[PDB]
Amino acid sequence: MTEYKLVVVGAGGVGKSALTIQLIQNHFVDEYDPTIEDSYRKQVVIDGETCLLDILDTAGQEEYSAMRDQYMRTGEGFLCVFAINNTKSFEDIHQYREQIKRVKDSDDVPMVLVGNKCDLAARTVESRQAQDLARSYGIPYIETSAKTRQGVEDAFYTLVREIRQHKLRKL
Ligand SMILES: Nc1nc2c(ncn2[C@@H]2O[C@H](COP(=O)(O)OP(=O)(O)O)[C@@H](O)[C@H]2O)c(=O)[nH]1
Numbered sequence: 001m002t003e004y005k006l007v008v009v010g011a012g013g014v015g016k017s018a019l020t021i022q023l024i025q026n027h028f029v030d031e032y033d034p035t036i037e038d039s040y041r042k043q044v045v046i047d048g049e050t051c052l053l054d055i056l057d058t059a060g061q062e063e064y065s066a067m068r069d070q071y072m073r074t075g076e077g078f079l080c081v082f083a084i085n086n087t088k089s090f091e092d093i094h095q096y097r098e099q100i101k102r103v104k105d106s107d108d109v110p111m112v113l114v115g116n117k118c119d120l121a122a123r124t125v126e127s128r129q130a131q132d133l134a135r136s137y138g139i140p141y142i143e144t145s146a147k148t149r150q151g152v153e154d155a156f157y158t159l160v161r162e163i164r165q166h167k168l169r170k171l
């Protein structure tokens, strides 16, 4: 299999861990605080296939890339765990990918915007604005929920869809 050094970004008020944890631990913890920090190593199943992946959780208690700054050197793909119920992180995403493209190398890395807890209704962040910003970074806006693990798979599979796809489109 291949390794997909993933990296999570966005506010911690959205559910940064729960999304990573789920996709890896495969279970919900709803206990991860906005300070812990660890990488989840485990292969998954991409478009019906599979690829060794490693999603970093990233902490907060700082400002932006000050939390997950120790792995950006290999940041293979960044997943924006913003919640459609907290535009806050949302404003924080544009700033997140901003620092990313800086540490990585350029401003065209494989990342995807996702509205976590989309299950219920609510939506402090305008839905139109969610896809809109996704078009700004060139990434798609997937709406999932770390609790329903329903979109979480297409959230981490879309980001890799950008990575895992390059290896071939190359030619
Ligand atoms: N219902 C529901 N709850 C969620 C979801 N994602 C996260 N949560 C919960 O919302 C709470 C707030 O998330 P938070 O702890 O701030 O996320 P984190 O610190 O960034 O990892 C957590 O305790 C989670 O259990 C989701 O998709 N659905």
Ligand SMILES: [Mg+2]
Residues within 6 Å of the ligand: 012, 016, 017, 031, 032, 033, 034, 035, 036
């Ligand atoms: Mg946490």
